[PDB]
Design a protein around this nucleic acid. Structure first.
Ligand SMILES: [Cl-]
Ligand SMILES: [Mg+2]
Ligand SMILES: [Mg+2]
Lengths: 297, 303
RNA sequence: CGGGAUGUCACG
DNA sequence: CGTGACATCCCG
RNA sequence: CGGGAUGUCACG
DNA sequence: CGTGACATCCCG
């Protein structure tokens, strides 16, 4: 192959798409859009429990990404968009290093403010909730810039770029969920693929509304998820063997109020929570009350 | 090590960005846009000569591309865009197999009809012209989807997708040119990078108007070109060492008329080629007349 | 050179 | 329906 | 849980 | 102008 040797004289162009691995999540970086292409993580009940704190971590450029192709906090702040992490920080309570690697900008995309801490947040919580029914949960997340047909019939992909480095703002976010009940069972695996628009949503629509077939998502994203997964074998819809239903307004508001006290140093903060709970029309469940009287010390 | 085996248990997702080598070019395919991301080729005096013929070739899907992520002629035909090859067929006249592999849709992007046959064609000509003065030249070509600033300040990337498979139509096309004078000399290498918009362009714009720096291109494209090339050494702007001058209207149409002499199958057809030249206020060069007189006499015998 | 419109025969 | 190879013609 | 606005000290 | 680790305060 002498002809091939001259062709490679100076080397092929580099795309920087090789898989980058961290202490509890891997990803492939898109050097052109300056966002991750896909982010893989494994969740177990053992991992979502720990002492790693979320406010001792800062969003910073991944020092493994060439600064030329890296994004920076200056691109997000005040751009009208938020820094949305794909590998959730909450999935790494067990390790402080793992949680800190979640805050590398290689793992975050521009995300609607309401969608981030709202609907998408609830999807991230449901993933952690599956750990109580499945010993192993694999999740794959990433951005999407999807087309949209217009009056004259033709389809146009259109997406915003923000900051000096032009970080691509996706029109949708995808999340594939693969769950197996036990390490020693051979139940069919539970699989679910979902595509959510990058915008405020609310509580009306059920997560089933956003479900799509795996092979479809693979077509719109140009990826092949879980190659080693024997597709000839029997695989079942995650939503037929589970709930696929996020927290309602009352549950979500209470969960936040329950977790807000854990970081409430002062007694004044606890007062506001109740005043806000009363302003919310909710009826404080006894669980929150048990975690209310213990922290009044 | 064990907390990783559980991650890889079902494997990482596949991107399909690995290089795919062929007879005279390589490329990395973009499975999401159904177009090549970059296409690398090497050309020389010997490779741009031969008996390989376009008209005995066909556009069709690269068989090494999963049909799921592949483009098909149905996506292009009737979409309002042409099939533009990044690795030119004219750069592989020496091998019938090599030329055939440039018609794989893995080497094709939706390209404006006028652009494909006009300005971009003339750029591919200038690359073949460099083989007269450089023994080896490398070319990287691919598509781009660049942003645009609205009046209100927002920057928007927009591009049409065509066909059922949503093949992306780039806003611009890029080309990186690297030429070394000789394998035994150590004259500084010459490099030029260019970004042309995917629309009709005439004969007034000079190639240097679309020239950019290698850094600027790598930032736009998210690629790094020619990694093993030492960037601290002495590298020259190709448009200073060479001409970066595309053919004007007269010599461009003249070149086409000469290439059409070979395909002339009747004396009357061959004379029509010359009448069109004269109607265009172009006087053929002595090379055309020799070629014209030759093909003429060749066609008179068997008639 | 770069793109297109067509026909015919053979065979899966 | 597709696969090949031979051919005719058009445009810039 | 998920995102933002501010401070004091320390070092390069 | 860049790296680490303390702190209080807003919002859904
Ligand atoms: Cl067409
Ligand atoms: Mg988030
Ligand atoms: Mg072309």
């Amino acid at each position: 192959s002498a002809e091939k040797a001259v062709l490679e004289q100076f080397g092929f162009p580099l795309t920087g798409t090789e898989a980058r691995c961290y202490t509890n999540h891997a990803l492939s970086y898109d050097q052109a859009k300056r966002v991750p292409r896909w982010v893989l993580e494994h969740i177990s009940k053992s991992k979502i429990m720990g002492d790693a704190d979320r406010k001792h971590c800062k969003f910073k450029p991944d020092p493994n990404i060439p600064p030329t192709f890296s994004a920076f906090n200056e691109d997000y702040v005040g751009s009208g968009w938020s820094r949305g992490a794909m590998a959730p920080a909450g999935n790494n309570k067990f390790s402080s290093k793992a949680m800190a690697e979640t805050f590398y900008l290689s793992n975050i995309v521009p995300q609607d403010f309401d969608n981030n801490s709202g609907y998408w947040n609830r999807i991230e919580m449901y993933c952690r909730e599956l750990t109580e029914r499945f010993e192993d949960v694999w999740v794959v997340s990433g951005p999407l810039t999807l087309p949209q047909t217009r009056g004259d019939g033709k389809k146009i992909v259109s997406y915003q770029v923000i900051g000096e480095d032009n970080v691509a703002v996706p029109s949708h976010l995808y999340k594939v969920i693969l769950a197996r009940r036990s390490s020693v069972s051979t139940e069919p695996l539970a699989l679910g693929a979902f595509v959510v628009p990058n915008e405020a949503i609310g509580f009306q629509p059920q997560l089933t509304e956003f479900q799509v077939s795996l092979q479809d998502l693979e077509k719109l994203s140009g990826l092949v998820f879980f190659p080693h997964l024997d597709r000839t074998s029997d695989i079942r819809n995650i939503c037929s063997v589970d709930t696929c239903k996020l927290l309602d307004f009352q549950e979500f508001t209470l969960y936040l109020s329950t977790r807000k006290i854990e970081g409430a140093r002062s007694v004044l903060r606890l007062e506001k929570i109740m005043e806000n709970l009363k302003n919310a029309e909710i009826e404080p469940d006894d669980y929150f009350m048990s975690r209310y009287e213990k922290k009044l010390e």
